Amino acid sequence: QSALTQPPSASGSPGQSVTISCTGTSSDVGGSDSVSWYQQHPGKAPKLIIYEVSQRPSGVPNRFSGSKSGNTASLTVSGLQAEDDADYYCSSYGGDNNLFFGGGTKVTVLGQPKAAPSVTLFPPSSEELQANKATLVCLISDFYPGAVTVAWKADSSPVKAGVETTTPSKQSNNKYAASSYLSLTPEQWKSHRSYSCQVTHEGSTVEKTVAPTEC
Amino acid sequence: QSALTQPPSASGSPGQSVTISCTGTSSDVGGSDSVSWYQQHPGKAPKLIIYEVSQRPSGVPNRFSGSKSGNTASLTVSGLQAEDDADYYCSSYGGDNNLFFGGGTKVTVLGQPKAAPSVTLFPPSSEELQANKATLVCLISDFYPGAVTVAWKADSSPVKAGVETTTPSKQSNNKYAASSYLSLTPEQWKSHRSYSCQVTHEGSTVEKTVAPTEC
Ligand SMILES: CC[C@]1(c2ccccc2)CCN(c2cc(C)n(C)c(=O)c2)C1
């Protein structure tokens, strides 16, 4: 899904430092010194802030520093300011002159206390089952920062199709909410023994499970 | 000063063609064949669609064609589809290891087909009832445009407290999704005959009802 592997999210308080990694393979990150980093504020055009692992373009403050160790490049942002809040991407040229990209890391300069998400997993409703639909819904609410990743598990294996997750939105309590729904057929829901929703936030994971109970 | 000049906006209806420009100088755009184009749906990672002025990466349909003349690069999107509604950025390499990005062009696919919402109401799960929670979720999906008003009913009376509704987010099917959830105590859920979710989209209203059952 993402050639280079970046953490989905990172965070720190104003004035602190935060380090985000960009892990590849021997033929890209560790094989050359062409790792770049890009910063994109929400709704803005991206900006190159690091090239050739460590070089800072003109106008990029020294608070941003890049390095590499093996197959993993790292960007460090010291003296975090609210302006540094943005999405950070890495890229690296490969062996056959192909450019590879990381998935991005959402960096949040905490503007309020951190809050873990409340998760509720709902099994199929009777009405939708009689309409040949067995959609599960994983409700996620009351979390901050608003970065979250969701993973569904049929029995114990990961599902890689039919998952949808809404963009997190601020609610009345100034915390974020979102929902992930898995569009299962009534057969899929009955054939397997249980489905699970896995939610990851600020590095920690929570998992709820549901199973057919003949109702 | 580092800024390629793109048109702020472009629009067109399905099946139409659209061309957007990326004007630089003789040192960046007109000084090499390193012009790239990136597509980005809001709230999502971008995708490189053109590199070296005209090359499409694998997976990019030939509906997207790039060109260059003087210091002005142009991207053309023929046969506009709903999934082409997004932001588009150009970039070009400049001397001094500089990578210049344009301001970005929001392409709007006009007159996309209206679609009524699929409404699925979920009663409290067996787990959250043990945990003394009785939250209901009204999953609303597959509707366009992304405007909906939600109303909740207890039996026949309106519900005025404990209602939250996420902001509709566009999903992979190019239609919107959202979840309205009602926070009830188990006593509220078991003391009423039914709760209803009323979703209104484009003057038309759908209603779903659930009631306490053995489940
Ligand atoms: C070089 C500019 C990039 C940018 C950033 C923000 C908006 C638009 C473009 C940086 C990340 N970037 C990607 C990233 C990913 C994951 N992919 C798959 C790409 O094809 C391209 C291109």
Residue A203's domain is classified under what CATH number? Answer: 2.60.40.10
Note whether B99 and B122 are same-domain residues: no
The answer to whether A171 faces chain B, any CB pair under 8 Å, is: yes
Note whether A159 and A103 are same-domain residues: no
CA A214 to chain CA centroid, nearest Å: 35
Tell me the best of B44, B48, B91 to mutate to test the pocket of ligand 1, counting ligand atoms within 8 Å of each CB and taking the most: B48
Note whether A192 and A126 are same-domain residues: yes
Boundary residue ending a domain (A109, A138, A155): A109
Would you say the C-alpha torsion B122, B126, B127, B129 has a positive or negative sign? positive
- How was this model experimentally determined? X-ray
CB contact under 8 A, B167 and A172: no
Domain count, chain B: 2
CB-based burial label for A167 (10 Å; 0-12, 13-18, 19+): middle
Note whether A156 and A197 are same-domain residues: yes
Alpha-carbon gap, residue A87 to B70, rounded angstroms: 33
B1 in a structural domain: no
Token output for B32: 């090499």
Alpha-carbon gap, residue B8 to B195, rounded angstroms: 46
CA A135 to chain CA centroid, nearest Å: 23
Note whether A97 and A20 are same-domain residues: yes
Does residue B208 contact residue B137 with C-beta atoms inside 8 Å? no
A182 in a structural domain: yes
Edge to edge, the sheet with strand B64-69 lists: B18-23, B72-77, B64-69
Alpha-carbon gap, residue B31 to A9, rounded angstroms: 37
* A window 101-140, beta carbon within 8 A of B: 101, 103-104, 120-123, 125-128, 133, 135, 137, 139
Note whether B128 and B102 are same-domain residues: no
Q: Which long-range contacts (CB under 8 A, 24 or more apart) does B44-52 make?
A: B45/A2, B45/A89, B45/A103, B45/A104, B46/A46, B46/B89, B48/A99, B48/A101, B49/B75, B49/B88, B50/B75, B51/A99
Q: Nearest CA of chain B to the CA of A81: how many Å?
A: 22
Tell me the best of A2, A38, A87, A99 to mutate to test the pocket of ligand 1, counting ligand atoms within 8 Å of each CB and taking the most: A38
Q: Which residue among B48, B97, B171 sits closest to A55, beta carbon to beta carbon?
A: B97
Token output for A159: 């599902």
Range of the structural domain that residue B122 is part of: 118-210
Boundary residue ending a domain (A58, A88, A109): A109
Tell me phi and psi for residue B192, to 5 degrees: -110, 160
A36 in a structural domain: yes
Report the phi/psi class of residue A162: left, alpha or beta, with left for phi > 0 and alpha for psi in -120 to 50: left
Using DSSP's 3-state secondary structure scheme, residue B25 falls into: coil
The answer to whether B8 faces chain A, any CB pair under 8 Å, is: no
**DSSP bridge pairs for B48:** B38
Note whether A105 and A131 are same-domain residues: no
Query: A182 to chain B: nearest residue by CA?
Result: B139
B80 in a structural domain: yes
Q: Which helix (H) or strand (E) holds A129?
A: helix A126-129
B138 in a structural domain: yes
Note whether B81 and B124 are same-domain residues: no
**DSSP bridge pairs for A64:** A77
Note whether B140 and B99 are same-domain residues: no
Query: Which residues from A are below 8 Å from B171, CB to CB?
Result: 164, 166
A167 in a structural domain: yes
Alpha-carbon gap, residue A189 to A207, rounded angstroms: 18
A1 in a structural domain: no
Boundary residue ending a domain (B44, B75, B109): B109
A40 CA to centre of ligand 1 in angstroms: 10
Note whether B69 and B20 are same-domain residues: yes
- B9-12 and B105-109 beta bridge pairing: parallel
A4 in a structural domain: no
Note whether B16 and B104 are same-domain residues: yes
Note whether B94 and B137 are same-domain residues: no
Residue carrying structure tokens 């997207």 = B64
**DSSP bridge pairs for A100:** A92
Q: Which residue among B122, B125, B166 sits closest to A177, beta carbon to beta carbon?
A: B166
